[PDB]
Structures are given as C-alpha cells and as structure tokens.
Amino acid sequence: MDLSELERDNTGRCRLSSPVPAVCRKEPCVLGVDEAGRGPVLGPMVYAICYCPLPRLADLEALKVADSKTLLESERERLFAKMEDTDFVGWALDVLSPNLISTSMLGRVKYNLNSLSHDTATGLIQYALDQGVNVTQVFVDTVGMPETYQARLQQSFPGIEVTVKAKADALYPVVSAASICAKVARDQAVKKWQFVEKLQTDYGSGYPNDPKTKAWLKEHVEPVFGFPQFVRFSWRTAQTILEKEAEDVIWEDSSHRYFLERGLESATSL
C-alpha cells in the first residue's frame, strides 16, 4: 500500500506499479499521464500513469482526488491511499534518478530532456498495454507544445484516442489522480534517498533560483569530482558553478608504424 521500493539505491530507473484490477482487463480504460521533478537541479524526476475503466469514470470524481497546488504532502498521501482501496483504480510510476538525467543529456549523442520525458511517458502507456490493461483513451498534461506530443503518441499508439493538453490536470480527473501519484512518489523518493557517496541535509525545493539550493550547491563543490550524484550535471546551474569552482576536464567530444599504431615512443624525461 505504501511506496517502500523507494528505500533501495537508484543510479538509473525505478519502476513501481499497483496490481492490475480485474475490471481493467475487460472494460475499455481511460489513462492519465503527469510528471514531478522536471525543473530541480537536485533529485529525481517522476512520471506517473493512473488508469480506470470507462463506466467508473464518474466514480473517480466521487472521491476528491482532484489536483491542487495548495495540497499538503500528507493531504496527497491520503488521496493516494483512497485510490489504493478502490477496486478499479490502477497506477504505474517511473522514478528517473538525477544520474540517469545527467548521463542521458551529457552522453556522446545528446538525448534531450524532452525526448527522455516523452519516452518515459510512452513506456508507461506501453507497460499498461503489456500488463493486460484495455487502454482505449489516453490523456496527457504537457508543459509546452501539445500538437507535436499528440502526433508523436498517435504514431506510437495508432489505435488509441490520444489527448494532449496544457493544464490537463485541472481539466481531466484521470490526469489529476496521476499528478497525486507523481508528487507523492517524488516527495517519498527525495525523503528516503539512499545515497551512493561516502559523505554526509537542508537544500530547499531543489529549484535553481532557490537561495537554499544555490547555497547547498556552492557548499558541496569538490574540485575533481564536482558534485555528488544527487545533482543534475546537465543543468546550466550546475555547469556554471563547475566552470568557476571545479578543475577543468577534457573529453574526446570537447618512428615506425608499430610504435605509432599503439601510441608508444622513447622516454626523454623521468
């Protein structure tokens, strides 16, 4: 019933799902997609999907599972549990570690944040399909352009009704519920974050403009390593601090044939 799986070490991806209801396999389902942790320099990014059958859509409105910016962490946890005791509500989470965000964006081939965000979304929609969920309608909340995202998802799912809209959380109840899952999972992920580094608290929201975050960032600068894995190296906030406070690093991106082929030469010094 609780997100206990978030207690173990994360260096890549961490998938969490509710058991698929019996109803969800037969009746046609409606799916909602939302995210938490897109903007912070610190911590993971969580993507969530929430599904329920078409007849029990009004029954989803019956419980006050609507999204709100005012909602407390405890207030969201009560609505999440209220979904868990519901015989028809299903859900699936994807907790992308700051290291996975860093490594993807800072790779040899640039895997952009928006592609990685959209690919995680399709992956959960596909996961549901593979799990016997009869998804016939998909509702997605977007931060930017809905036209391209909707066209993308239609090519990925040509037999499913795809609706991508800005502020879809305030408009559709499935998207509101998915939003509660993402926020709860994000809060719980940053709360009990198992940390890979052998050194050890208050950082704030994790956002770049946050004074506590930039204070924590400046404090945790190491000249050789730069920052611990909890920081998103790809973010311009981390990069600028690194450029001024840490030591320079050079990557490939930024005499007879035998000896020349294997970078060998005679030593003139030491």
């Binding site: 860093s102 580094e197 190491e222 690194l242 030591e247 294997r262 970078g263 060998l264």
Partner: protein, 127 residues
Amino acid sequence: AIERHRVHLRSATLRDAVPATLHLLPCEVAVDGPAPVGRFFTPAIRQGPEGLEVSFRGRCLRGEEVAVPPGLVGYVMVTEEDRFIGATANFSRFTLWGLETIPGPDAKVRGALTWPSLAAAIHAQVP
C-alpha cells in the same frame, strides 16, 4: 660529475609496496594531487550488462579490469618538484575506463601492453 645524468631508485622500497587501485580514465584532468576517490568514485561503481558502470562529471563510464601480463610487475614511482626516486606502491591490475562503452580491441593502451613480450624477443641474443 657523471651523477647529473643519473636518478637513483630505492631498492628497499620495491619490496615494501601494498597493492594500489589504478583506474585509467578516458578524460584529461588538469590537476595533480589528492582526491576522495573512496568517497565519490569507488562507492558508485556498479555491475552492468557490458561491464563495470560508473559516472564521472555526469558522464557514463563503462570499463573492465585489465590484468598486468605475466613477466611484468607494476610499480608506482614518485619524484620531487644527488637525484632520487622511490617505488611507493605495487599493482597486479588496473581498471580501464571508456566513455559509454568499454574501449575496443584496437585501443592503443591494449596495443602498448603487448610490447614487452615482442621487445623480449627482438632484443634476445642471436645464436
């Protein structure tokens, strides 16, 4: 007089040498000094599909532990800023690191390792 061209090494320090963990990075780090490798690097090393997985500066590094070939011994020598040099540590193997993937079989480091074997035959006394 002729000592100017020769730098002497402590023979007793070659015996007193505990194995040292050697990592060969695919990036150039301008600094030369101490580092908390055991704080950032070592506890982050993971086991993946290809080989060992770790990330340095937010970039994924994938590598394998390369063994020092039989007939060779690894020593780490230190010199100051009569001339002297001393073997501080020993090593039986070094971990090789490549960006995203383990360096190929055509990697120059792997080619250089096959030299002392050929050099032992090139320079052998003719009968």
